Design a protein around this ligand. Structure first.
Ligand SMILES: *[C@@H]1O[C@H](CO)[C@@H](O[C@@H]2O[C@H](CO)[C@@H](O)[C@H](O)[C@H]2NC(C)=O)[C@H](O)[C@H]1NC(C)=O
Ligand SMILES: *[C@@H]1O[C@H](CO)[C@@H](O[C@@H]2O[C@H](CO)[C@@H](O)[C@H](O)[C@H]2NC(C)=O)[C@H](O)[C@H]1NC(C)=O
Ligand SMILES: *[C@@H]1O[C@H](CO)[C@@H](O)[C@H](O)[C@H]1NC(C)=O
Ligand SMILES: *[C@@H]1O[C@H](CO)[C@@H](O)[C@H](O)[C@H]1NC(C)=O
Lengths: 48, 48
């Protein structure tokens, strides 16, 4: 049900954030891309 | 005219930000250092 990002050689699930991932292109080009939510750690810091 | 940062093996220009670069030293030591503007993605989030 949930999506995580792990190191390749050892299972260690982390919450998918903007500090784990980078942005390039859009979803109309990558084959097999999946919808999910990426957590932004700066948003609740701004809100609080 | 403009300055970008790209991976060395494939031309893919990106906006020079504090997440693409690291700070060390000052302008008076590096030979050939060039003036430019480094974008900070946190400033417009703080301002908005
Ligand atoms: C991922 O979400 C996007 C929208 O956030 C979905 O794209 C939509 O597709 C439906 C049906 O084709 C359209 O009614 C919407 O107008 C589309 N929105 C956009 C922004 O394109 C996409 O289908 C979702 N991906 C999957 C496979 O679930
Ligand atoms: C980069 O911009 C700085 C200004 O922020 C320039 O530094 C000035 O240049 C001359 C002296 O070299 C005078 O305007 C000031 O005394 C300098 N300021 C400081 C604090 O160094 C610098 O010359 C510019 N570099 C280039 C090549 O344009
Ligand atoms: C994987 O292959 C199946 C066919 O067995 C297809 O239905 C599915 O869309 C494919 N998914 C991706 C990400 O290529
Ligand atoms: C590069 O070479 C030119 C001569 O063609 C010289 O004017 C310039 O100062 C040099 N710059 C550096 C950083 O060595």
């Amino acid at each position: 049900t949930h999506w995580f990002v792990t190191q390749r050689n050892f299972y260690e699930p982390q919450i998918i954030t903007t500090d784990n991932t980078f942005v390039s292109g859009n979803c109309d080009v990558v084959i097999g891309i999946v919808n999910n939510t990426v957590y932004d750690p700066l948003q609740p810091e701004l809100d609080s």
